[PDB]
Amino acid sequence: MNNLYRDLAPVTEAAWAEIELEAARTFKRHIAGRRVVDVSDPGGPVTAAVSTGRLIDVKAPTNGVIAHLRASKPLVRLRVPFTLSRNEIDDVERGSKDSDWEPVKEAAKKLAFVEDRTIFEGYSAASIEGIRSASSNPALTLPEDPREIPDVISQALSELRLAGVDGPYSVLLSADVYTKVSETSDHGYPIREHLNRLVDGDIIWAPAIDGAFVLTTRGGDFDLQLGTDVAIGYASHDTDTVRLYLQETLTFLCYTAEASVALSH
Amino acid sequence: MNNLYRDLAPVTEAAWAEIELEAARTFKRHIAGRRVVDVSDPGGPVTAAVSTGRLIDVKAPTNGVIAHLRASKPLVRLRVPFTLSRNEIDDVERGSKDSDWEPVKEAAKKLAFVEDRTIFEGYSAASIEGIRSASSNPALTLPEDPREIPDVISQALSELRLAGVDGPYSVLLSADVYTKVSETSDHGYPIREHLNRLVDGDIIWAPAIDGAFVLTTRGGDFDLQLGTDVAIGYASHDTDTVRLYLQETLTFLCYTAEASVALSH
Amino acid sequence: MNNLYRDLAPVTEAAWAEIELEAARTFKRHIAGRRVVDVSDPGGPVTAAVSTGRLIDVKAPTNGVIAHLRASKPLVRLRVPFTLSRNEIDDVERGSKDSDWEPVKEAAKKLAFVEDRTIFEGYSAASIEGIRSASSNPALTLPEDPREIPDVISQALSELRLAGVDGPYSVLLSADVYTKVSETSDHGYPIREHLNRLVDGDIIWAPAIDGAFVLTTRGGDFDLQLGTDVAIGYASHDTDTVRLYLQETLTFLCYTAEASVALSH
């Protein structure tokens, strides 16, 4: 067995298939970051750091010796525990199709939110700079009126053009901004369609982020490094409940500072 | 023979084909519910209940014995009798093509209305909770002005987005609401087209329901269980008329409470 | 895995084989009901109810609609927990052949007693009518003197003959009555042999029932429906003991009211 200790969990095979399906579905729906960044293959469990290729000056060991430390970025392992009713698990073999997988959905939504907020806003404790912090283009303010959203977005499209950047540009919106441009309409279309006319990429719902992000998806600018992708593991169990977790280990690198514009309220 | 006792009816083969065609056509046109919910294969005549996979605590038979009743949902058999003129039946072999099949059409419309109102509004006596009652998302009020319909509908699309739900969303409208958004026009399109721009699913005419319903059609959320699909059976006959019926047996299950928004006036 | 969670139990393979053998043996010995009634194949875990094929009038949904609920019988799941010493379990791999399986035997005897008392005396909370309650033939009183038992039994054989019933008749006795007709002797035979001469079926020891039952085993009159047969499942464990359970889910149907005579003291 492995670190998931999956065979020790009192979960049947059919219940496991339903839990895997629910977690994978809810996660994909709430991920916006993997649609725009380069996603590496999983390095594996032993992978601990990503080389940046830079060098750090250290106090010379002896006379005439020049020493340099190799710089690297550590992976962070992110774990979201959740708790399942054993009655709901037992219902699945009897043929129930409405078993309560709400904790699985909440854990997948929380893991997806962490991953997206780590990619776009950073996680300083894990030495990850967000796309918002690593952007060299000027930051823009989103207006109160949703009918004035496409104007400011177009100004962001000016900045990537002034930065000398090609590629399909894509706009990612926070859930508040996505709702505002979805529910306001002008001439038989919502403002989301007006945003769709400005770019050759995609208007992407990004419920974890704040503000908005416009960026190129030409490739090679944004890199998500995975040691291991999302997995479900077993912690402990009692007569009534099974404690499990969702787990993934990653770091994020931004190679190109001028490939994005961040917007705030 | 079977319970339809079809060979006992004084109905010719050509008349039977015309009656089957008329009933099937009028039924499909008036069904909205089967277009959005999962529809099972017919279980058969012996099928009486659907297992939910839950357990009900009962008074212990003896000391040290723990007993539980299996929970289930009963099927309901729905029968709509109708009456045909025997002269109209006899006209069909002579080559008439305008035989009065209005009672067949009224029976098919009434059966379709019952089935749709059972799926969406429930039938408490049959222990069926409607989609409106089983929805956990907040209920919305439809405005008087049809030009303000797409706004509220978009708010419903916000709620499924706040519920963490994917899939093609579909909007079902009552006949009053469908007529209101069909006959009012803005900038060369009716408001029904404005509703069509908001979703990747379908604006569906639902003449049996009240208000409106917005919901996902990703699958696995709404389940209609059929023991036997719609069939035409023979009751009795006299010199002038044949009494027949339309009959179907079903139950409805909603597994996912947050997959729908109900709207009312 | 399944709902038994059998691989989570700290029970070795040899100990499992001994426990299965002990439980199966003690159960068969104490079952009288399955020898006389029709026993269905196991429906499976999803099976929750048995259709009776009857209809229940419900308040009409709308005008001109006739509604009927399908009638059914719910299954009941019967669970008997028991507790095993872990030292006795560990003794089995070392080659012990006298490991204390008394709790397994007591659980199997209690499960068998419940099943037989449910078949013959009913379980009202599970909507099961016993054979004694569902019998339309008159009830008889068993005499105090065991030498007068065969007389009354013969009167019961008159009643099934007056009911117009064929087939091998079988007599089931309570443990008190079986002991009384076993230990009293007349002319070199116990009274049990005198009972054996009256029928072409079998004198059956039935320690769970009260009184006596005479009935035909021609088939199709008494039906035991099993969702799942007897299984051993794992609940929880500590350093000293393993808590397990015996479990079976069933209902009982009597189709033929005149196929039996019940006797009481």
Residue numbers in the entry:
A (entry chain W), B (entry chain F), C (entry chain QA): 1 to 265
Question: Can you list sentences taken from the study reporting this PDB entry?
Answer:
Encapsulins are a class of BMCs characterised by their conserved subunit (Enc), which self-assembles to encapsulate enzymatically active cargoes and can remain porous to cargo substrates. T = 1 encapsulins of Mycobacterium tuberculosis, the causative agent of tuberculosis, and the closely related Mycobacterium marinum, are known to encapsulate the DyP as a core cargo with iron storage ferritin protein (BfrB)28 and FolB as possible secondary cargoes. In vitro cryo-electron microscopy (EM) single-particle analysis of the Mycobacterium tuberculosis encapsulin was used to obtain three structures of the encapsulin shell in intermediate states, as well as a 2.3 Å structure of the fully assembled shell.
In addition, we studied partial encapsulin structures to characterise stable encapsulin shell intermediates in vitro, by using low pH conditions to disassemble encapsulin shells, followed by reassembly at neutral pH. To explore the structural landscape of encapsulin shell formation, we used 2D and 3D (focused) classification and local symmetry to determine the structure of different stable encapsulin intermediates in an incomplete assembly state. All three intermediates have an even number of monomers, appear to be closed on one side of the shell, and miss subunits on the other end. The 48-mer and the 52-mer differ primarily by the addition of two more Enctb dimers along the edge, around a point of threefold symmetry. The addition of these dimers appears to increase the stability of Enctb subunits that previously were located directly on the edge of the hole. Based on the predicted positive ΔG for Enc-Enc binding within pentamers, inclusion of dimers or pairs of monomers around trimers could be more prominent in driving these reactions.
